[PDB]
Every structure is written in structure tokens, then in C-alpha cells.
Amino acid sequence: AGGGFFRGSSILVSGVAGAGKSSLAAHFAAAACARGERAMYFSFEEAADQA
Amino acid sequence: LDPISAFTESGDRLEVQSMLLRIVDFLKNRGITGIFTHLDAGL
Numbered sequence: 848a849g850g851g852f853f854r855g856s857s858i859l860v861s862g863v864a865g866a867g868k869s870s871l872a873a874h875f876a877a878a879a880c881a882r883g884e885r886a887m888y889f890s891f892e893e894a895a896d897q898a
Numbered sequence: 899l900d901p902i903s904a905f906t907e908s909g910d911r912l913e914v915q916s917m918l919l920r921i922v923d924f925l926k927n928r929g930i931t932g933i934f935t936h937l938d939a940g941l
């Protein structure tokens with residue numbers, strides 16, 4: 848309801864290997880970048896070029 | 899690497915993960931294809 852999460856909020860994309868957590872996070876980031884804001888991606892298991 | 903499960907017994911919680919990550923990153927940087935067989939956690 849309302850059409851989205853709250854801004855200053857925390858979101859947990861819980862899953863297992865092969866679920867798509869990283870891609871959902873990347874979609875969040877792409878939303879931020881397309882709306883003119885800045886986003887950060889802290890990868891701990893993947894190179895940035897690989898991402 | 900067959901099997902990467904052998905090193906589980908001979909190492910602590912973080913040291914085994916660090917060793918495996920070292921090998922993974924080495925093969926990645928040199929561009930080698932890395933086949934890893936295991937007998938699976940965050941691995």
C-alpha cells in the first residue's frame with residue numbers, strides 16, 4: 848500500500864543461492880540512479896565488472 | 899580442484915574460507931576457469 852517502501856528504511860532480501868537477491872538489489876540501485884540520485888553497491892562476493 | 903571439502907577438516911572457521919577465497923580470487927585475476935568439486939553453505 849502507498850506504492851513503495853519508506854525512504855529512510857531497511858529492506859532485507861532474504862534468499863538462497865540462485866534466488867535473485869543481488870538482481871533485486873541492483874534494480875533498487877538502478878531506480879536510484881535513473882531518478883537522479885546516487886547509489887552504492889557494496890559487493891562482498893562479486894567483482895563490479897562481473898556484476 | 900577435487901575435492902575442496904578435504905580442507906574443511908584441516909582448518910578453523912575463517913581460515914578455510916580465507917584459503918578458498920584466496921584461490922578463487924587468484925584464478926579469477928589470472929582469468930583461469932575454476933572448477934571446484936564439493937561433497938553448500940555460503941560457498
Ligand SMILES: Nc1ncnc2c1ncn2[C@@H]1O[C@H](COP(=O)(O)OP(=O)(O)O)[C@@H](O)[C@H]1O
Nearest residue numbers: 862863864865866867868869870871872873893
Ligand atoms: N537472461 C536470463 N534469463 C532468465 N534468468 C536469468 C537470466 N540471467 C540470469 N538469470 C537468473 O538469475 C539468477 C542469479 O541471480 P543472482 O542475482 O545471482 O541471485 P544470488 O546472487 O542471490 O544468487 C540465476 O538463477 C539465473 O537463473
